[PDB]
Amino acid sequence: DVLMTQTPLSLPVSLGDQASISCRSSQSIVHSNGNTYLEWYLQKPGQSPKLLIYKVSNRFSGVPDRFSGSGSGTDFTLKISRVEAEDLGVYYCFQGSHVPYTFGGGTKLEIKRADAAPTVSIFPPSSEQLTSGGASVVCFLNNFYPKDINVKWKIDGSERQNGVLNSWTDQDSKDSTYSMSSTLTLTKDEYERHNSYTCEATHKTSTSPIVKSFNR
Amino acid sequence: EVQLQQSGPELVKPGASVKMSCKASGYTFTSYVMHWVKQKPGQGLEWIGFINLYNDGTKYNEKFKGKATLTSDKSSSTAYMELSSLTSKDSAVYYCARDYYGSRWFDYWGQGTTLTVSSAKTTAPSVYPLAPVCGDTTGSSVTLGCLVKGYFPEPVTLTWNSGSLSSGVHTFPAVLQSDLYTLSSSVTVTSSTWPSQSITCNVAHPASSTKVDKK
RNA sequence: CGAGGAACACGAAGAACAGACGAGGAACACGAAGAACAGA
DNA sequence: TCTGTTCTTCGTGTTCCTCGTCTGTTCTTCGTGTTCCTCG
Numbered sequence: 005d006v007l008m009t010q011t012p013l014s015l016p017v018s019l020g021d022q023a024s025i026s027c028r029s030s031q032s033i034v035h036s037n038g039n040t041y042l043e044w045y046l047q048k049p050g051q052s053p054k055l056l057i058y059k060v061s062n063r064f065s066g067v068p069d070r071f072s073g074s075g076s077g078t079d080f081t082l083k084i085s086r087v088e089a090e091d092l093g094v095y096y097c098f099q100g101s102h103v104p105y106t107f108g109g110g111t112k113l114e115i116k117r118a119d120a121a122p123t124v125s126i127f128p129p130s131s132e133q134l135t136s137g138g139a140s141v142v143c144f145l146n147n148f149y150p151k152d153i154n155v156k157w158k159i160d161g162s163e164r165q166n167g168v169l170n171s172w173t174d175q176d177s178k179d180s181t182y183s184m185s186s187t188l189t190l191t192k193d194e195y196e197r198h199n200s201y202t203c204e205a206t207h208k209t210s211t212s213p214i215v216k217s218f219n220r
Numbered sequence: 221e222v223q224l225q226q227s228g229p230e231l232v233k234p235g236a237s238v239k240m241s242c243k244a245s246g247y248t249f250t251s252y253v254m255h256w257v258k259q260k261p262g263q264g265l266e267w268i269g270f271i272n273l274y275n276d277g278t279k280y281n282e283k284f285k286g287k288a289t290l291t292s293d294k295s296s297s298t299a300y301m302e303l304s305s306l307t308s309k310d311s312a313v314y315y316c317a318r319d320y321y322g323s324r325w326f327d328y329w330g331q332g333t334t335l336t337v338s339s340a341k342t343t344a345p346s347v348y349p350l351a352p353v354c355g356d357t358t359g360s361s362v363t364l365g366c367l368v369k370g371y372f373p374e375p376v377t378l379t380w381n382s383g384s385l386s387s388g389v390h391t392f393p394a395v396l397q398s399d400l401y402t403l404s405s406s407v408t409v410t411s412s413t414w415p416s417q418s419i420t421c422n423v424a425h426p427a428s429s430t431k432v433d434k435k
Numbered sequence: 436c437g438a439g440g441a442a443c444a445c446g447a448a449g450a451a452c453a454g455a456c457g458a459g460g461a462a463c464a465c466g467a468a469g470a471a472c473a474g475a
Numbered sequence: 476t477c478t479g480t481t482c483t484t485c486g487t488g489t490t491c492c493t494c495g496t497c498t499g500t501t502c503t504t505c506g507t508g509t510t511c512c513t514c515g
Contacts, residue, residue, distance in 0.1 A: 037496095045326075058320070064327070104282060107257065107265045130350075132346070142367065144404075171393065171402075173391070187404060250493080252494080253493085275492070278460090320494090322458030323458075
């Protein structure tokens, strides 16, 4: 069986700094020819991925020379400096030794920037859904820079994390942040048992958790 | 210009058999190997198989042997899978691949398909425009959006003003659990753009609906 | 004095030949690993 | 215990088909070196 170790799972990179990523093999990598054949692939979100590095350091015909590859043994590194904006995506390394030619995932690019303030808004449900015997409170909480966000929902002083769905987003191309949607979905008889509706979030810039309660 | 093309999205029943066709362009076909990769989102990718286009050496994985069958044809310039023993955990993206050396790496990739397994019934979506709390502009900026509930198929593609508004937009994924899909999108627009520039939510949906809702 | 044409070269580009390496399957005489119907 | 044979995994050697690499050899061109000729 083939396992691969992605010790750089994530990375801090801004536009202009350096990075080194070491895809690490569980066992040796050598071949009967004495060489090793290791390949790294780039996926920008939206299109099919393509070949970037094919042996260790030599590459595909027509790529920029700004990336570089190095290493031999059980861990293999790629180095980048003066990071641009059009080469974002997800990287992949291929295992070069054992007979089951299994892929290796889990190496993504993370743009570093300043932190962003939360944007909190509440949506009581539209009347078309209220005519169908159900209701859904929406709390949109946007422009979250890190990924350690803890959400809670409150209904008239009572903590219930039931009937709640939550929706994420990936790394934005221009905003370069995250976004957050929280829906609490119940029936209309389950709606009007209480009056005030609260969404609470746990962020790091706001040193206290942010609490927002509305009435209708 | 050596690129590849595949079929479109596919919806299939459990227990059935489904097909993959793979076309390319440019150079010859019988001199090289066609290679084939699986991808499921939220999880690392996985190699499926390979077929050389001269002798047709049939060999699959240690797990996927006897599961999917790999064939090709030169006159149609096409590669073929057939998939059986179907189940709902493989509703994912499958990727055709061009070899560069002896079935040892890949050099360019096709667009793949979304192979999905059908569940429940294909229902038309229910769209709701997001109404503000106070109505008109009562602050520095206002927030609007779209709430869609109750549709089976994934191509529910969300456009604003028929393809516009690529700036200040929050596209969102859909949830496949219990065959209940919720789409919630939000746009934060400026203070002086409410009464004339009312941006409309647009669901593009081939099996069900081309639906447009204005706030 | 600076340069070009004719035959040879420092290095580079296009191309071809000869040899070797390995990568993938096909065919054949034989070897190892598990089994089944009948016969001696 | 084996044979007539069949359903599968791994080698002993060869050939066919495709390919990425390495070394030597040859033909043409270019930034230019040796003698003749020519250009102002």
